[PDB]
C-alpha cells in the first residue's frame, strides 16, 4: 500500500512516497504533477494538515493532475482511506442543519440531488454504512469531500464552507482481478 507523488508529469522529477498518512510533504516537493497509487485509496489535500481542496485517488497511475480532476499542482498532505471492498453503503441526507427537516435515505449513487430529491443543498447527513464522496456539482464534478461512517451535524464536519452539494456516490476499494 503506497502512494508516490512526483514533481513533474509522467512520474518524472523529485518523488515523495507515503505508506499511510503524511501531514506535510511541502519540504520535499514544491508541487505535484503526477501520482502513482498502489494497493489502496488515498485522499490528497491541497495544503498541509489535511486542509484545502481534496481529491480521492483509487489505485492507478495519474500522469497529469487533470487525471484526478485536480485544479492545479498544489498538494501538501494525504491520508489513507479505510474502505470496504463490498457491501451496501447507506447515507441519510437532511434538508436542514443538525438533522432537522426532511430526511432522504439512499443506498444508490445520485448524479443530481435536485432531480432525485428536490434539494438544492445538503445541510447535515449521517453515513450509516460504507463510504461516500460528495461533490459540489452534478454528475460527480467540482469540489469533493470524503464522508466515512459517522454523523455530520453541519458541512464544516465534512470539510466544507458551504452546504452546496449536487451529487454523491459510494466508494469501495478497487482491486485488480489477477489470474
Swiss-Prot record:
Q: Where is the Beta/gamma crystallin 'Greek key' domain?
A: 1-39, 40-82, 89-129, 130-172
> Would I find Membrane among this entry's keywords?
no
Q: Does the keyword Acetylation apply?
A: yes
Keywords for this protein? Acetylation, Eye lens protein, Repeat
**Biological process GO terms, please?**
lens development in camera-type eye; morphogenesis of an epithelium
Q: Which domain of life is it from?
A: Eukaryota
Q: Where is this region: Connecting peptide?
A: 83-88
Gene Ontology molecular-function annotations: structural constituent of eye lens
Q: What does this protein do?
A: Crystallins are the dominant structural components of the vertebrate eye lens.
What does the record note on quaternary structure? Monomer.
Similarity comment: Belongs to the beta/gamma-crystallin family.
Q: What is known of its domains?
A: Has a two-domain beta-structure, folded into four very similar Greek key motifs.
Q: What is this protein called?
A: Gamma-crystallin S
Gene that this sequence comes from: Crygs
